[PDB]
């Protein structure tokens, strides 16, 4: 693509620079370029890919929510014409395009080459996450299929994580957190959400004793998010 002439190492270096400069669109383009080199990504490089796209789509999601809220208020209200809907649709399309880009990278060919637990679970979690973001804005005949695609990716990731990783592994914990959010916010399954969050928290608690000081800090940070959700949900 557009980054085809830049060295892989230069793309990673520039992604790190873009991160420091809070230039997340640039960061995502650099990391897309790096993925398109065709080599597998290290843990650090997967982190850069994740941070870049999360920030890009995060801005889009926040904007979409603002616009959807204005649109819902107008449709109850003095007629304002098509502009609110048009602009919401514009932001929605751009958001869908980012999600499709990420899903395309995962499908061509990150997931299929990912054989270690940390890589495969990370990528399948990501697949679940970006289908979940598609589901947040879906309203037509594919909302159900999008939700099922998210579910299927999260489930495959969960099955591997339970077999191959300790209950305190940050990737395993972040996956379970996000799958619980999927259940609560997308799948209309609050009880499944609560059960997953509780079981995850409890199994991690029981394994903290095995960890170093640094790993303990990492795991307990994510456990606190499970607890914050459980407080919100119960």
């Amino acid at each position: 693509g557009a980054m085809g002439s830049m060295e892989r190492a230069s793309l990673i270096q520039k992604a790190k620079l873009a991160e420091q400069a809070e230039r997340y669109e640039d960061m995502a383009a650099f990391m897309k370029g790096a993925v398109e080199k065709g080599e597998e990504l290290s843990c650090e490089e997967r982190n850069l890919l994740s941070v870049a796209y999360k920030n890009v789509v995060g801005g889009q999601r926040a904007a979409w929510r603002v616009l959807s809220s204005i649109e819902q208020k107008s449709n109850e209200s003095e007629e304002k014409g098509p502009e609110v809907r048009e602009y919401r649709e514009k932001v929605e399309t751009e958001l869908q395009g980012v999600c499709d880009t990420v899903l395309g990278l995962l499908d061509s060919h990150l997931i299929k080459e990912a054989g270690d637990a940390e890589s495969r679970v990370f990528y399948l979690k990501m697949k679940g996450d970006y289908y979940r973001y598609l589901a947040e804005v879906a309203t037509g005949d594919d909302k159900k299929r999008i939700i099922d695609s998210a579910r299927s990716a999260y489930q495959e990731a969960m099955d591997i994580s339970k077999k191959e990783m300790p209950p305190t592994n940050p990737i395993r914990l972040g996956l379970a957190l996000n799958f619980s959010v999927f259940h609560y916010e997308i799948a209309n399954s609050p009880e499944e959400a609560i059960s997953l969050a509780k079981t995850t928290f409890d199994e991690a608690m029981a394994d903290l004793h095995t960890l170093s000081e640094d790993s303990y800090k990492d795991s307990t940070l994510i456990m606190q998010l499970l607890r914050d959700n459980l407080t919100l949900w119960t």
């Binding site: 982190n47 994740s50 941070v51 999360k54 920030n55 996450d129 940050p170 972040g174 957190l177 996000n178 619980s180 959010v181 609560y184 916010e185 940070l221 994510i222 998010l225 914050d228 959700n229 919100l232 949900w233």
Partner: peptide
């Protein structure tokens, strides 16, 4: 308020 998903780390 919405549920918290995994943050950037």
């Amino acid at each position: 308020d919405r549920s918290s998903s995994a943050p950037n780390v």
